[PDB]
Amino acid sequence: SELLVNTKSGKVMGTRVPVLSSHISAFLGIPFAEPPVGNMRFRRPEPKKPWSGVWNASTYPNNCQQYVDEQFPGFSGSEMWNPNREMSEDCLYLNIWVPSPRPKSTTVMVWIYGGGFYSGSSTLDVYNGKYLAYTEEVVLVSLSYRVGAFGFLALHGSQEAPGNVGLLDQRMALQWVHDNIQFFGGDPKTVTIFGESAGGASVGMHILSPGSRDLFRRAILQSGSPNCPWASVSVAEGRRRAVELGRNLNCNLNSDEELIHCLREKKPQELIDVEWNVLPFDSIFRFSFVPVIDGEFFPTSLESMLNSGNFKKTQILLGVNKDEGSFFLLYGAPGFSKDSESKISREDFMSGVKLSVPHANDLGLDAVTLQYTDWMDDNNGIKNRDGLDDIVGDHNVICPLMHFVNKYTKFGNGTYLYFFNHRASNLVWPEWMGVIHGYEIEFVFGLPLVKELNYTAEEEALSRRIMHYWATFAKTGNPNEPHSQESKWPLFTTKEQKFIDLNTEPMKVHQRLRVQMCVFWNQFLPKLLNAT
């Protein structure tokens, strides 16, 4: 029967689950690597030893060890992103949704969760693959990978903690999908990877990494790209942070070997409790243990790779949300509140600017301030609030993605760019936060098709629209229906740089996404910081 499947690594048994009046198969918690436990903590992943007997794939796996967000307890807006399973270093598992009856050889989509490389789970309600597998006839996979120090502690030159092992976890899952997804009705030649925030950066990083390029066909990046200022560190800075982690836990620092031994003997929670102390600056939108520019996973610097065309050349679909910064301001900048309009005083604006651009010298902070201050109205608290939102959004997400899309399009085989600006009717966050980082994911996964979630009819329509864009792009490399009366989503080209609004209104075409501010962030400010 469908629910019993054999794989090169063992037999797997899944469950028939309901979805929207019908049913499909789910294979939850399939292992793709050895448990990275004990002396394998921080090591590259090794492949899952094949198993005798049937592997029960009926329930979601454990989540990886991570910092848990408790700033707003008992509030669904935050807790929807927390782990909803027990946390464990034994966490390298993947989930597969397969339509019923099983397809012969159909399109595969692999989801890479975000969470700043320090958090995330494949098991979140919002990542439930069944609505997408069902409505669009695709084999939907969600993988997992180690986060925080467990996935990204980087002592470049050591073999026991080399960095990027979290990215290697993702590759090994991609490898396992590669060798085994046929058995589930999946076409290994038509794998689309997609992911949001750190998951979107991860996708770009597999586009760049030679060791990953053969494992998928095309890619979707949502509010994330590999060159984001928070998504990687130098080898030197990763070493600095790893040593500082040990220093925080009273470790022998005389040598990599002693440092790593100490860190391997600490309980997971003792590492998590000091994770944030290794950051060089007071900041927002900065995370301690992230990918490292090592010379192996990334042969050279990201910019040099992007300039020379040293990356997988294929089709990409990608975009951003309208209010990317507001989440991080609420959590980390003075004057913001979940319980008020968060009018920001001039004094708090200045504090926010420094937290948002922590690497900038004072001349750089003045440049940011002048670029974003309305000097006809410098005490308007709402303009200051919105200005910080744009600063955080532009610097951390939108302008790096625009730099990636312009560099990629010179060599790629087709680009589609969106600007998601629909605020869900049922959003639990306050209105000033707008179209929040992460809140397009629920439309991509079909959650508005469920009536118990009380979205509006227009919102269900937009979800079906988005899902059909995403799925058609995965199958054909083009999100547009082949010969439709519906408005086409135009290719983004070097010359005209078109993109679409994704919202409930009829699709509109625009050009040069926030081009003025991204010249500031991508050309001028870096030039000013290199000189001063």
Next chain:
Amino acid sequence: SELLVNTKSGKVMGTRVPVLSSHISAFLGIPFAEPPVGNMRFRRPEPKKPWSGVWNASTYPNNCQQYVDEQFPGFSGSEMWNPNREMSEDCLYLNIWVPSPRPKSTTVMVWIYGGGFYSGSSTLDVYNGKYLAYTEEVVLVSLSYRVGAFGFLALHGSQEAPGNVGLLDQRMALQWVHDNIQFFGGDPKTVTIFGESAGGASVGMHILSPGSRDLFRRAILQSGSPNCPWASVSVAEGRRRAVELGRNLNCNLNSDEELIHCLREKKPQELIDVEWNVLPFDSIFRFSFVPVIDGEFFPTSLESMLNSGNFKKTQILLGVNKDEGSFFLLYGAPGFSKDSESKISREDFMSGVKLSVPHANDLGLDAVTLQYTDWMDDNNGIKNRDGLDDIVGDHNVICPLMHFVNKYTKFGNGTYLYFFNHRASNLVWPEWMGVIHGYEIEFVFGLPLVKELNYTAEEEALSRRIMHYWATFAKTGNPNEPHSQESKWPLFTTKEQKFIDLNTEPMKVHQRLRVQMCVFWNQFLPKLLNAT
């Protein structure tokens, strides 16, 4: 009779001249200093030795030696600013218009012509004082002063070419008005000095200079202020330029004495023909021989004087025109033409930016470019043209004047600020040049009251309006009529920074004149240049 007047220096005979259906007395060409000729070239002025007999004051005097503008020969737009008398080093004379019958003790206004401190004449048609003396019952004086190297060659430390002698020429005329204007029906206690461009900067410089403050009551500055980037140089830079002038003329440079002797033996025209070669940069809105920050005429730096309140505290009225830059672009920047719309290419925009901010390093040029480029539309030739106009206008006139007005208002006794934006119906320059530097002067002097000049009725109305503002301010320190139904021109205050439009439409009140761009020019760019 009126036309015969005695003065502490000699007797003076004037002419009865017609003006608008009536008549007034004119006293043209009264000398206030010894001819600064021969060995007195470059020396401070000495007062005019009193004379026996009647001085014929019937005709305009000679004009000072100056560079003559011949870039558009036989074109009234340019030739209206050229000397209209014979040029001579014997040029320190003043003119007086006195109403008929002679007033007992009425308000005096003294005009200081502009021309970049390298040109100008009291005798230009457009400076004809009769329409203002007549229509507003004031004793109108126009003075003169040495320009170019003759007025501003600066070898700080020498007594034979110390710098600022052109400004000393102006003071001595102010002194002569001070001791002698009673005899013409003038109240020496109620002298308003006023002036445009370099004349406006000159006014501010007498406001600042201790040796000048007692010689007038209040002041009007038109499109000029003492801190303009072109209106002064350091002692070191003035010395550099003086030596380079000698170098251009093959002089002994071993010593100030030898250098000055050589320069004193050259014909005026040999100095004029190399005047522009001493500029350190290819540039526009930069002039070779200007006031020097010497420690005597100016006790300390202008900024330190402005910060500490070390200046004459009284009432000031001042303002700018809408399109200050276009004159200098037409003459000196690539792509501009008197015979076309002057759409400016990206390549020519970049050249223009460097000519306009010649002291800026490359990072500074990028900052200017980014501040003034519309990156949604960077190839729009009209936007580039208008952007250069704003760059030249903001950097050279408007933002320095806004810095002066904000600094002055902290200590002064009342400020009135205008924004002149009427384009005369009969302007001979092309339309893209807009409201040109210098073209409010004809309204201040009443030229639209003459019907042979074919201004419109509204333009005559605006001229009478402006003349009554200027004259009432000179008499009372306030341009508003004491108890009128007419809209008041509000005081400019530190807190609300109000100003008015001066045009044919009903007066409008605005606040914070070009505040966004002047933060760039007055705070950020100087900070960037000091760091890099």
